[PDB]
Short mmCIF file of C-alpha atoms in Angstrom, two decimals:
data_model
loop_
_atom_site.label_atom_id
_atom_site.label_comp_id
_atom_site.label_asym_id
_atom_site.label_seq_id
_atom_site.Cartn_x
_atom_site.Cartn_y
_atom_site.Cartn_z
CA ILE A 703 1.95 -14.35 -3.03
CA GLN A 704 4.98 -12.43 -2.46
CA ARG A 705 4.01 -8.46 -0.70
CA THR A 706 6.44 -5.56 -2.68
CA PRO A 707 8.31 -3.37 0.08
CA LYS A 708 7.36 -0.55 1.16
CA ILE A 709 9.77 2.28 1.00
CA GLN A 710 10.66 5.51 3.79
CA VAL A 711 14.06 7.26 3.20
CA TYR A 712 14.99 9.93 5.64
CA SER A 713 17.59 11.06 8.36
CA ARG A 714 18.62 10.02 11.54
CA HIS A 715 18.72 13.19 13.01
CA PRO A 716 16.79 16.66 11.59
CA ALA A 717 19.28 17.47 8.48
CA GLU A 718 21.49 20.31 9.28
CA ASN A 719 23.79 21.48 6.01
CA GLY A 720 27.11 20.08 7.07
CA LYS A 721 26.95 18.31 9.80
CA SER A 722 27.22 14.28 10.28
CA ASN A 723 24.00 12.55 10.25
CA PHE A 724 23.15 8.74 8.87
CA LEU A 725 21.11 9.05 6.02
CA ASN A 726 18.47 5.47 5.96
CA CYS A 727 16.15 3.60 4.25
CA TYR A 728 13.59 1.41 5.54
CA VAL A 729 12.18 -1.58 3.74
CA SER A 730 8.72 -3.19 4.98
CA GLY A 731 6.24 -5.56 3.99
CA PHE A 732 8.48 -7.12 1.70
CA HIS A 733 8.12 -11.51 1.38
CA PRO A 734 10.36 -12.88 0.06
CA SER A 735 13.73 -12.27 1.14
CA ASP A 736 15.15 -11.35 -1.41
CA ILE A 737 16.09 -7.63 -1.33
CA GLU A 738 18.62 -4.97 -3.21
CA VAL A 739 18.86 -1.75 -1.79
CA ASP A 740 21.42 0.89 -2.71
CA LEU A 741 21.63 4.52 -1.24
CA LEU A 742 23.28 6.95 -4.33
CA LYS A 743 24.30 10.35 -3.78
CA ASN A 744 23.54 12.63 -7.26
CA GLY A 745 22.77 9.21 -9.13
CA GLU A 746 25.79 7.08 -8.19
CA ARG A 747 25.77 4.45 -5.61
CA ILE A 748 26.94 5.31 -1.54
CA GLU A 749 29.94 2.80 -1.38
CA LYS A 750 29.49 2.00 1.97
CA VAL A 751 25.44 1.18 3.51
CA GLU A 752 25.05 -1.54 6.22
CA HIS A 753 21.95 -3.80 6.78
CA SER A 754 20.05 -4.47 10.17
CA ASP A 755 19.01 -8.10 10.82
CA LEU A 756 16.08 -9.71 9.41
CA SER A 757 13.16 -9.90 11.31
CA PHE A 758 9.64 -10.02 10.00
CA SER A 759 6.05 -8.69 11.11
CA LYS A 760 2.65 -10.33 12.52
CA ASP A 761 1.04 -10.49 9.12
CA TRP A 762 5.55 -12.43 8.33
CA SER A 763 6.77 -9.79 6.81
CA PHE A 764 10.19 -8.88 6.61
CA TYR A 765 11.95 -5.13 7.37
CA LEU A 766 15.05 -3.94 7.45
CA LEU A 767 17.19 -0.48 7.86
CA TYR A 768 19.34 0.45 5.43
CA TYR A 769 22.37 2.76 6.33
CA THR A 770 24.78 4.60 5.60
CA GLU A 771 26.93 7.87 7.04
CA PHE A 772 26.28 10.93 5.52
CA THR A 773 26.67 15.09 5.89
CA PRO A 774 24.36 16.77 3.91
CA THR A 775 24.51 19.56 2.08
CA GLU A 776 22.86 22.14 -0.04
CA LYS A 777 23.34 21.07 -3.17
CA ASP A 778 23.47 17.13 -2.87
CA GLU A 779 20.84 14.48 -3.47
CA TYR A 780 20.15 11.83 -1.84
CA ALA A 781 18.03 8.73 -3.00
CA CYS A 782 16.90 5.07 -2.62
CA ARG A 783 16.64 2.58 -4.70
CA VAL A 784 15.61 -0.81 -4.24
CA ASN A 785 15.20 -4.39 -6.38
CA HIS A 786 13.17 -7.16 -5.41
CA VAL A 787 11.52 -9.44 -7.98
CA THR A 788 8.21 -7.77 -7.06
CA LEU A 789 9.72 -4.93 -8.73
CA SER A 790 9.50 -5.50 -12.60
CA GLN A 791 11.97 -3.16 -13.09
CA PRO A 792 14.05 -1.02 -9.71
CA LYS A 793 11.80 1.96 -7.41
CA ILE A 794 13.94 5.02 -6.31
CA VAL A 795 12.33 6.87 -3.37
CA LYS A 796 14.32 10.42 -3.53
CA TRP A 797 15.09 12.14 0.25
CA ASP A 798 13.37 14.40 0.82
CA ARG A 799 14.69 16.99 3.61
CA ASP A 800 10.63 17.70 5.66
CA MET A 801 10.09 13.94 5.51
CA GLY B 1191 4.86 -2.18 32.62
CA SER B 1192 4.39 -5.58 30.43
CA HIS B 1193 6.80 -7.10 28.77
CA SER B 1194 8.05 -9.57 26.08
CA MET B 1195 10.55 -11.82 24.57
CA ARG B 1196 11.02 -13.17 21.00
CA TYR B 1197 12.89 -14.60 18.49
CA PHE B 1198 12.53 -14.42 15.51
CA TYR B 1199 14.25 -17.45 12.47
CA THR B 1200 13.81 -17.44 9.22
CA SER B 1201 15.36 -20.16 6.68
CA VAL B 1202 15.44 -19.25 2.74
CA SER B 1203 17.03 -22.35 1.03
CA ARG B 1204 18.58 -21.59 -2.64
CA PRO B 1205 19.37 -23.53 -4.91
CA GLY B 1206 22.20 -24.36 -6.93
CA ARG B 1207 24.12 -22.08 -4.86
CA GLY B 1208 24.97 -23.93 -1.38
CA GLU B 1209 23.16 -23.74 1.98
CA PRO B 1210 20.20 -21.79 2.92
CA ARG B 1211 20.95 -18.65 4.51
CA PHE B 1212 19.41 -18.94 8.31
CA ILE B 1213 19.01 -15.68 10.51
CA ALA B 1214 17.49 -14.95 14.10
CA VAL B 1215 17.92 -12.12 16.06
CA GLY B 1216 16.64 -11.38 19.33
CA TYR B 1217 13.94 -9.19 20.84
CA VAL B 1218 13.26 -8.22 24.16
CA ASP B 1219 10.25 -5.36 24.13
CA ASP B 1220 11.26 -3.25 21.07
CA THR B 1221 15.28 -3.52 21.80
CA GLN B 1222 16.72 -6.09 19.14
CA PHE B 1223 19.76 -7.79 22.30
CA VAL B 1224 21.35 -10.98 19.72
CA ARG B 1225 21.81 -12.24 16.34
CA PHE B 1226 23.71 -15.15 14.91
CA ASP B 1227 23.29 -15.77 10.43
CA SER B 1228 25.16 -18.40 8.45
CA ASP B 1229 26.54 -15.53 6.29
CA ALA B 1230 28.72 -14.62 8.81
CA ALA B 1231 31.98 -14.79 9.66
CA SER B 1232 31.73 -15.75 13.28
CA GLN B 1233 29.93 -18.62 13.21
CA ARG B 1234 28.84 -17.41 16.61
CA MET B 1235 26.11 -15.85 18.03
CA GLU B 1236 26.64 -11.50 18.87
CA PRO B 1237 25.06 -9.74 20.82
CA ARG B 1238 23.06 -5.99 18.96
CA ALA B 1239 22.60 -4.74 23.50
CA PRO B 1240 25.12 -3.49 25.35
CA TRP B 1241 23.16 -5.46 28.99
CA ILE B 1242 23.66 -8.92 27.36
CA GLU B 1243 27.92 -8.70 26.83
CA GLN B 1244 27.99 -9.26 30.24
CA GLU B 1245 27.10 -12.91 29.90
CA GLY B 1246 29.49 -15.36 30.02
CA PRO B 1247 31.74 -17.24 27.79
CA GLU B 1248 28.80 -20.45 28.27
CA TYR B 1249 26.05 -18.23 26.98
CA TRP B 1250 27.25 -17.46 24.11
CA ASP B 1251 28.49 -21.29 23.65
CA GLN B 1252 25.37 -22.65 23.89
CA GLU B 1253 23.40 -19.95 22.19
CA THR B 1254 25.27 -20.21 19.44
CA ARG B 1255 24.70 -24.82 19.65
CA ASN B 1256 20.77 -23.70 20.04
CA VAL B 1257 20.61 -21.23 16.51
CA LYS B 1258 22.66 -23.74 14.71
CA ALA B 1259 21.52 -27.05 15.41
CA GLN B 1260 18.11 -25.17 14.24
CA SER B 1261 19.91 -24.30 11.42
CA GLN B 1262 20.29 -27.82 10.77
CA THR B 1263 16.45 -28.53 11.51
CA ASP B 1264 15.36 -25.89 8.85
CA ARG B 1265 17.74 -27.66 6.62
CA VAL B 1266 16.08 -30.72 6.35
CA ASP B 1267 12.39 -28.92 7.41
CA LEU B 1268 13.09 -27.03 3.94
CA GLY B 1269 13.18 -30.38 2.10
CA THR B 1270 10.64 -32.12 4.15
CA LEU B 1271 7.53 -30.02 3.50
CA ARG B 1272 9.24 -29.58 -0.49
CA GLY B 1273 7.94 -33.14 -0.57
CA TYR B 1274 5.02 -32.78 1.27
CA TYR B 1275 3.66 -30.48 -1.54
CA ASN B 1276 5.40 -32.21 -4.51
CA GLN B 1277 7.04 -28.69 -4.67
CA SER B 1278 10.58 -28.54 -8.15
CA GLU B 1279 14.15 -28.32 -6.81
CA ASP B 1280 14.21 -25.36 -8.66
CA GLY B 1281 12.53 -23.53 -6.60
CA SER B 1282 13.71 -21.09 -2.88
CA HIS B 1283 11.03 -21.65 -0.18
CA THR B 1284 10.86 -19.97 3.12
CA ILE B 1285 10.64 -20.35 6.37
CA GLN B 1286 10.06 -18.43 9.22
CA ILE B 1287 9.55 -19.25 13.09
CA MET B 1288 8.51 -17.23 16.59
CA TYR B 1289 8.39 -17.96 19.27
CA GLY B 1290 8.92 -16.40 23.13
CA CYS B 1291 6.19 -14.77 26.36
CA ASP B 1292 4.76 -12.18 27.48
CA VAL B 1293 5.16 -11.29 31.38
CA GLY B 1294 3.01 -8.67 32.82
CA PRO B 1295 3.92 -6.59 35.69
CA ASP B 1296 4.86 -8.39 38.56
CA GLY B 1297 6.73 -11.50 36.42
CA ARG B 1298 4.64 -13.81 36.36
CA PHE B 1299 3.94 -15.22 33.19
CA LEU B 1300 0.92 -14.02 30.54
CA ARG B 1301 1.30 -16.34 27.61
CA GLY B 1302 3.49 -18.14 24.95
CA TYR B 1303 3.61 -18.64 21.82
CA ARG B 1304 5.32 -20.71 18.81
CA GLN B 1305 3.85 -20.01 14.87
CA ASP B 1306 5.89 -21.45 11.95
CA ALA B 1307 4.89 -20.14 8.09
CA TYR B 1308 5.85 -22.20 4.79
CA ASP B 1309 6.57 -19.78 2.28
CA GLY B 1310 5.14 -16.16 3.94
CA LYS B 1311 2.34 -18.09 5.15
CA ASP B 1312 1.04 -19.58 7.91
CA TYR B 1313 2.14 -23.38 8.19
CA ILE B 1314 1.93 -24.83 12.30
CA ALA B 1315 0.67 -22.38 15.12
CA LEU B 1316 0.94 -23.90 18.97
CA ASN B 1317 -2.18 -22.90 20.60
CA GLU B 1318 -2.72 -20.61 23.51
CA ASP B 1319 -2.96 -23.56 26.08
CA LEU B 1320 0.70 -24.79 25.30
CA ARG B 1321 -0.97 -28.14 24.13
CA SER B 1322 -2.82 -28.41 21.30
CA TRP B 1323 -1.55 -27.70 17.52
CA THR B 1324 -3.04 -25.70 14.70
CA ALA B 1325 -1.84 -26.70 11.63
CA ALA B 1326 -3.08 -24.15 8.46
CA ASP B 1327 -2.75 -26.69 5.85
CA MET B 1328 -3.19 -30.64 4.96
CA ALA B 1329 0.70 -31.13 4.81
CA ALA B 1330 0.96 -29.63 8.23
CA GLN B 1331 -1.12 -31.89 9.42
CA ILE B 1332 1.39 -34.50 8.53
CA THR B 1333 3.42 -31.88 10.58
CA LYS B 1334 1.63 -32.26 13.53
CA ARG B 1335 0.74 -36.04 14.08
CA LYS B 1336 4.42 -35.56 14.12
CA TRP B 1337 4.82 -33.35 16.81
CA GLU B 1338 1.85 -34.65 18.83
CA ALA B 1339 3.36 -37.92 18.88
CA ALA B 1340 6.59 -37.24 19.99
CA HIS B 1341 4.91 -34.74 23.18
CA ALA B 1342 6.36 -31.71 20.81
CA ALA B 1343 4.07 -29.19 22.62
CA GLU B 1344 5.11 -29.88 26.40
CA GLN B 1345 9.22 -29.09 24.96
CA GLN B 1346 7.26 -26.00 24.44
CA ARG B 1347 5.41 -25.27 27.42
CA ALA B 1348 8.18 -26.31 29.98
CA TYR B 1349 10.32 -23.36 27.93
CA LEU B 1350 7.92 -20.81 28.28
CA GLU B 1351 6.13 -20.94 30.90
CA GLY B 1352 9.96 -22.09 32.35
CA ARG B 1353 13.64 -20.67 31.03
CA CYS B 1354 11.95 -17.75 29.12
CA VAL B 1355 9.83 -16.26 31.41
CA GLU B 1356 13.26 -16.29 34.48
CA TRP B 1357 15.88 -15.17 31.16
CA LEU B 1358 13.64 -12.09 30.65
CA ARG B 1359 12.84 -11.53 34.29
CA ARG B 1360 17.04 -10.99 34.77
CA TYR B 1361 17.17 -9.43 31.28
CA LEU B 1362 14.22 -6.72 32.73
CA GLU B 1363 17.09 -5.73 35.22
CA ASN B 1364 19.96 -6.12 34.23
CA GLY B 1365 19.09 -4.11 31.11
CA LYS B 1366 16.32 -1.53 33.02
CA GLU B 1367 18.19 1.66 32.83
CA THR B 1368 17.11 1.33 28.58
CA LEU B 1369 14.48 -2.10 28.74
CA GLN B 1370 12.67 -0.27 32.06
CA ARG B 1371 12.90 4.04 30.51
CA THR B 1372 11.26 5.51 28.19
CA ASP B 1373 11.81 8.09 25.89
CA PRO B 1374 9.66 10.92 25.44
CA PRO B 1375 9.18 12.56 21.75
CA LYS B 1376 10.68 15.30 21.19
CA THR B 1377 8.31 17.20 18.37
CA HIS B 1378 8.41 19.00 15.69
CA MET B 1379 5.87 20.88 13.53
CA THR B 1380 6.85 21.56 10.31
CA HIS B 1381 4.65 24.33 7.25
CA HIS B 1382 5.30 23.67 3.49
CA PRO B 1383 3.03 25.83 1.63
CA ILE B 1384 1.63 23.73 -2.18
CA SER B 1385 0.38 26.59 -3.68
CA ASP B 1386 -1.16 30.04 -2.87
CA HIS B 1387 -3.46 28.10 -1.61
CA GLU B 1388 -2.82 25.13 0.33
CA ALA B 1389 -0.50 23.53 2.59
CA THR B 1390 1.01 21.16 4.66
CA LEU B 1391 1.39 21.03 7.70
CA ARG B 1392 3.71 18.61 9.38
CA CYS B 1393 3.26 16.94 13.25
CA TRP B 1394 6.67 15.60 14.15
CA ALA B 1395 7.72 12.70 16.82
CA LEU B 1396 11.34 11.47 16.89
CA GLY B 1397 13.43 10.20 18.46
CA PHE B 1398 11.35 7.57 21.42
CA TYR B 1399 10.88 4.79 22.67
CA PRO B 1400 9.27 2.69 22.54
CA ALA B 1401 7.89 2.32 20.03
CA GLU B 1402 4.09 2.55 20.09
CA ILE B 1403 2.33 6.46 19.69
CA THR B 1404 -0.34 8.46 18.60
CA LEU B 1405 -0.22 11.45 16.81
CA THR B 1406 -3.61 13.29 15.67
CA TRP B 1407 -4.96 15.85 14.08
CA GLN B 1408 -7.54 18.21 14.78
CA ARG B 1409 -8.51 21.44 13.83
CA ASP B 1410 -11.28 24.09 15.10
CA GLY B 1411 -11.14 21.13 18.42
CA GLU B 1412 -12.66 18.51 16.39
CA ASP B 1413 -10.68 14.60 15.03
CA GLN B 1414 -9.93 15.23 11.03
CA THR B 1415 -8.33 12.27 9.27
CA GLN B 1416 -9.86 14.36 6.03
CA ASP B 1417 -6.99 14.48 3.90
CA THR B 1418 -4.45 13.59 6.01
CA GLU B 1419 -2.27 10.94 6.47
CA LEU B 1420 0.43 8.80 8.62
CA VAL B 1421 3.30 7.61 8.06
CA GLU B 1422 4.47 4.18 9.77
CA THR B 1423 6.77 4.40 12.28
CA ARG B 1424 10.31 4.00 11.59
CA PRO B 1425 13.49 3.57 13.65
CA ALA B 1426 15.71 5.45 13.97
CA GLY B 1427 18.99 3.38 14.06
CA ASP B 1428 20.54 4.48 17.26
CA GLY B 1429 17.08 2.41 19.13
CA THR B 1430 14.70 4.55 18.49
CA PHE B 1431 12.09 5.19 17.44
CA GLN B 1432 10.34 8.15 14.40
CA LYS B 1433 6.78 9.12 12.67
CA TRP B 1434 4.66 12.19 11.31
CA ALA B 1435 0.57 13.31 10.93
CA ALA B 1436 0.61 15.60 7.88
CA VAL B 1437 -2.58 17.34 7.58
CA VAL B 1438 -3.40 19.94 4.12
CA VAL B 1439 -5.20 23.39 4.69
CA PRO B 1440 -6.03 26.01 2.86
CA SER B 1441 -3.48 28.69 2.91
CA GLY B 1442 -4.90 30.93 5.98
CA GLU B 1443 -6.36 28.61 7.83
CA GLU B 1444 -3.42 26.27 9.52
CA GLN B 1445 -4.17 29.04 13.08
CA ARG B 1446 -7.33 26.95 12.80
CA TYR B 1447 -5.18 22.82 13.18
CA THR B 1448 -3.88 21.00 16.53
CA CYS B 1449 -1.82 18.48 16.30
CA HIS B 1450 -1.58 16.59 19.59
CA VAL B 1451 0.99 13.66 20.72
CA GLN B 1452 -0.18 10.55 23.10
CA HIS B 1453 3.59 8.85 23.85
CA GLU B 1454 4.69 6.19 27.31
CA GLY B 1455 6.90 8.40 28.01
CA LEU B 1456 5.39 12.40 27.93
CA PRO B 1457 3.66 13.03 31.65
CA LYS B 1458 1.04 14.87 29.93
CA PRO B 1459 -0.55 14.20 26.23
CA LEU B 1460 1.25 17.47 24.38
CA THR B 1461 0.01 19.87 21.20
CA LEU B 1462 1.30 21.73 18.49
CA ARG B 1463 -0.29 24.28 17.14
CA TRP B 1464 1.64 26.62 14.15
CA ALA C 1431 17.64 -16.84 25.92
CA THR C 1432 16.86 -19.20 23.10
CA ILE C 1433 15.03 -22.82 22.98
CA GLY C 1434 17.25 -25.45 23.14
CA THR C 1435 15.70 -27.74 21.07
CA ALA C 1436 15.22 -28.06 17.05
CA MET C 1437 11.78 -30.01 16.08
CA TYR C 1438 11.09 -31.46 12.92
CA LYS C 1439 8.58 -30.83 10.79
#
């Protein structure tokens, strides 16, 4: 049995246009651990993305945080793009500053 | 006033692509404090919290030796289990191990844990008595007989009631300014029209520690769960957590609704109204 | 601090 990731995309701090922040993509509930997470700016890959150390929950499913420094603006669109063996194609989740 | 220490190990085979990946992480409560990764350059256990950086080189040397020895056990065990199950050498498989201890407010031992999975399902677990094992299937019964012969439960119990508790107490004292402090949630409400007829109210809790929290919605004083949504608690990236709860309401009726926030760091529960 | 024993299966 394989488990598909849950995905949340959000900022460290409430977004303020022109103020430096961190863009986060939190993936959880997945198995097995191999997973591909990119963060996108206007559809293009963000070059520098770091991630937390792999850990797991009581049901043995894994969780990871992927993150980049960013400065939000009114017009730039951010997103996370996740691939996993459970996904028939990559899943793109858009950043909404109100979620 | 109760506290926990946990270690989480993961080994993943990579047939055709070298030796297995091994990752170890340690936590006190909701705070990660150490890590090891087979694929990192250092080949050393590394600090992840400020209060562990004070430990001396003998501490880092010993922790490194221990996790390297477990990584080599896991490599061998991935082969052993493959053979018990008659699995192909072409497949990637996973071993996961959790262990650690809980202490009460007086520092006394509450209980210990050691549990193991294979491919994300229970394989073998140390029972709460720390004196016997539960095997999940016939392959794990082989391992159980091996561990019974080896007195493995006594080894585990000696650590869990001894070293584990003594070091958790040490970390709680050295790290007290953060581990024993609560950060209450910073709370606010947002409002998001859907149409002229409906709107979303979203109640936010940000920057809190520890992770446990309750957010609830009320309509005219009564708990409402219809037409609500609660997101899973998520890390902020800085050691704190975030959560929100939302309700869809009829436009004009927003001020009927309240959100209540409960957290250990709050002198009193918070109420929010739009 | 981690356990020192590693248990083979």
